[PDB]
RNA sequence: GGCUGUCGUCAGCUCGUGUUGUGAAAUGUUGGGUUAAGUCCCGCAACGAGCGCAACCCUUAUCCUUUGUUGCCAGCGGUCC
């Protein structure tokens, strides 16, 4: 990936001097305008290092989640892991939708079953009172759980794009086991994953890239 | 044992799995609103579920169909009215 690229991008942007992380010294640069700056030499070489290790676990058909649920990295994420075919989530992490498999599997066939119960048509012929909570039922799981429907099964890698702001799912993946790859910034913990890749985690320019190339890897990756 | 009063027809009382704590425990069940109501909604390390709440039952208020005696008499005709 272009260390240019990113100059335009502002990944190497990070957060005001007063709310650092002092885990994250190793991948500053300095500070202009009271303002940290990421050491994008460091980004670079650490980010291609996990472009790589997604490869060969897409490469055996293993699936990347992606998860991202800033109200701007959203739209982001959904289209990523669409042009890829993998699994998304963009709307809060509830407690437990890894740990808790058991329980939160078990409210996906509900969704499944209020799909059906659409388009077969039989929200419809019915009390038209109950086709508000025969619908706002279904809406509400489709933006929870939607993303995840056909997943069956836990991930074989997250993808994160804030560590702060999603630790719950970072926690309940160091739980199982399960690799992570986060897009660290200057205001936040190294120590729960496993490859960090530095650099600004609130830009919708910056967003954009590290995720078209993990989905450009993981389709360059699905097919040998 | 069975049956019954009572707080109280008050809106409460809990469980599974997950998470937190060395541990009793906690979270959910808190927060913003709303409601007669843990009523509903939005948030949220919770995700769900159950007993309650409400609804299903009887009665009362209006209308329609069917049936018309031992009940009824609007229009007719008769009358010991
Ligand atoms: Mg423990
Ligand atoms: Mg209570
Ligand atoms: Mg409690
Ligand atoms: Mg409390
Ligand atoms: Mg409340
Ligand atoms: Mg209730």
Redesign the pocket.
Known sequence: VSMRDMLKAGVHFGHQTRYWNPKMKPFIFGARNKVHIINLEKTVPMFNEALAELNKIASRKGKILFVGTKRAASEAVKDAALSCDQFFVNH?????ML??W???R??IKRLKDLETQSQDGTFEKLTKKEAL?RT?ELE?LENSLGGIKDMGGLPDALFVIDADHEH?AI??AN?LGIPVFAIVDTNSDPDGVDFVIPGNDDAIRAVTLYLGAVAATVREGRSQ
Do not use: C, P
């Open positions: 809060r992490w509830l407690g437990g740990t808790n058991k329980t939160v078990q409210s909570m706002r509400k719950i926690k309940e739980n």
